[PDB]
Amino acid sequence: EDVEIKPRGYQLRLVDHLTKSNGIVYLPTGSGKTFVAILVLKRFSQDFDKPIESGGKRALFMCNTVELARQQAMAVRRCTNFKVGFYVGEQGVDDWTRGMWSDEIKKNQVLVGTAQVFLDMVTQTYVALSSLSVVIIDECHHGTGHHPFREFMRLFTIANQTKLPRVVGLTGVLIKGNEITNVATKLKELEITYRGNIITVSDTKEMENVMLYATKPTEVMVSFPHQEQVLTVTRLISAEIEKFYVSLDLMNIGVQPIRRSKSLQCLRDPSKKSFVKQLFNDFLYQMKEYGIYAASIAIISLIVEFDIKRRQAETLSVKLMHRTALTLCEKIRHLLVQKLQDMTYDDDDDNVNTEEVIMNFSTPKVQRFLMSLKVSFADKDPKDICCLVFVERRYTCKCIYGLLLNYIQSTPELRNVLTPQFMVGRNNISPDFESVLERKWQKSAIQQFRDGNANLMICSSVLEEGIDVQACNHVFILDPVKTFNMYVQSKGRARTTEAKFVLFTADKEREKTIQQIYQYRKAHNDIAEYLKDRVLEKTEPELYEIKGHFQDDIDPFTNENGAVLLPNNALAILHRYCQTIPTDAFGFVIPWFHVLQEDERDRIFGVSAKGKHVISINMPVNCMLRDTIYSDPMDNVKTAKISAAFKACKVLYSLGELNERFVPKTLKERVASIADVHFEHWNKYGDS
C-alpha cells in the first residue's frame, strides 16, 4: 500500500500508551489492531539502521503459524519502508552457519517468522535479548503451557533484567478452551506471562462506536428432530468391517516399531494398523451421522486414499493389506450404490431425481442444512454471496463438499450461484476423487475464495483465525460448538453489515446449547466490565511472582558462550540429535524409554523412590552413550520424561556431541577441529 493509511481515534492513544509502557492489546478481530501494531513498530525504529556492534538494533515480529507469518510479512513490507526479514523452519535456516546468519541479521531492520525459529536462534547466541528494540506478539492467547511463546518469554526471566526489549501482544480472544470459570485468574496469568498490562477500549460514544465498524453479526439457530432408527445395510457393513478388523489383526507382517500409550502404561496397535482402523472408524461415524448418500461420497475418498497408500506402500505385505482394504471398500461401495439406486426407479427426472435422492437418504440434520441453504441464498447473484461453514471432522469437510457439489448440480437455482470448495488443516487430504494429482494446480482454495472463484468454503478451525478474509455475511456451524475461543472467533468473521450468524443443533440438544451460548456471552461481557474497572497498576512490577511463575519446573541450564538450554525443548533436541545418526528405515533413532518399577526404583534409589516415579533412557547402539541414564524422580511421567531428556542432552553436551550453540555437530565441526592438527602445511601453501 501507501501512506493513505490514517490512524483512527483509538489507535493513536493505543500506540501512545504502548510507547510509555509494555502492554497487551485486546481488540475485536478486524479492528485494525495490526495497523496500530505497525505504528508501534514505527516508534521503535531508531536503532534499525546501524549495525549490531555499532549500537544498532532490530525488531522481532512474532507469529504462531507459517502462513499468518508470511501474510503479515507482506503486510508490514507493503505498509512500511524497512528491510523485513522473513524466516521459517521450512525456509532452510536450520543449516545456517554463523556467517550466513550474521549477514541476514545485519541486512534487515525487522524480523518475522514462527516461534520455534526465533526461540532457537535466540538460544543459539545468534542475537541477545539486549540486542533487540521491540517484540510484537500476535494471538497472544496461545501463550500457555509449554507453548513456544511462553518458553520464549521465560528467556526474559533468565536473561538480563535491564535495558530489556519491549513486549506487546495482539489478540481478540483471551481464553483458549473450556476454562471460562474464573476469568480473572486467567487474565492475571496472561498479564504476568507477557509482563504487561492489558489495555482495552474505554471511551464509549466517540470510540467504541467508531471501532464497531466490525459490526456484531445477527445470530439465529435451527433445531431438527433426532433420527433414531438404524438402516439394515449399516449392520451388514459393520459386520464386514469387524471381520476385516479380525483378519487384519490376524494377518502377519514383519517386525514393526512398537507404538504404545503416551504415558507408556500399556501397548497399542502398530501405527499402520491403527491408521487404517482410524480411517474405517471415521468413515463409519460419517455413515451413521450423515446417512448413506454421504457415506457413498466418503467411500470414494477412502478408495482413493487406500489406492494412494498402496501405491506408496514400499513393502509387499503392506500392499496386500491395502489391497484387501480396497476390496472391502469396493464391496461397500457396490452395496451403497445399489441401495441408492434402489429408489431411483420410480422417478425419471434426472436433476429432480438426484435432488430428491439426496433429500431422501440423508440424515435430517443435513436435510435441514440444504433446505436452509436454499431458502437463504434464495437464487441471488453469485458475486455478492460469500459464506462459510464449519464442521469438526476433516473428512466431514470433503464429504459435505461432494454433497454440495451433487446438490448444486441438482438444483437450477443453485447451479449458477454457488461454487463449493473445501480445505483442511496441515494434515492435508487430496481434494481429488479419481487419482493422485488428477491435474496440477497452483491456486490455494483460500485464494480462490478471495478472488470470487469459490463463494462457499468448507473448513475446520484451520480457517478460524489469523488468515485474513474479507467480511463474510453468512456463517454456518453444523457440528456443535466446542469451546469459547472458536465461537467468538467465528462470530467475529461475519463482519459486514447485517451479517448472519447461523448454527444448528438437534431437538434434544437445544436446551444444553442455551447454557453454552449464554455463558459465552457472559464471558465476553464480564471481561469488558472487569478490564474497564481493573486496578490501575503500571506494568505488573511484581518480580517476585514473575519468578514464582516458572520456578516449579526444572531450572534451565546455560553454559559458557551465553548459550541457554530450555528443559521443555530437551525432547526435541534429543530426537533431532538422534535423527542425525545415519540409519536405514526400521533402524530406530528415537531413544526407547522405559518406566522404572517400584522395587527397582528403591533398588537403585532411596526411600523417596516409592513416593514418585522414575523413567529410564536407552540409546541405539550407534550412539556412544551406551550407558543408560536414569531420570530424576519426578511426580508424573511427563516431568520424568522431561528430566530424563534434559539430563541426557546435558550428558551429550558434556561429551561434546552437542555443540556450543546446543545443536548436533555435522562434519564441519569435525574437520574444523582436525584442520589445524593434520592440515597445517596447507596454510603455508595458501590453502586449507
Binding site: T218, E219, V220, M221, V222, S223, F224, P225, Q227, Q229, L231, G291, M343, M359, N360, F361, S362, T363, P364, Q367, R368, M371, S372, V502, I517
Partner: peptide, 16 residues
C-alpha cells in the same frame, strides 16, 4: 426405516 422421514418443509430461523 428404508426412507429417512422428512423434516418439516416449512421452518424459520429462531433468534437467540
Amino acid at each position: 426405516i428404508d426412507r429417512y422421514e422428512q423434516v418439516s418443509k416449512d421452518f424459520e430461523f429462531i433468534k437467540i
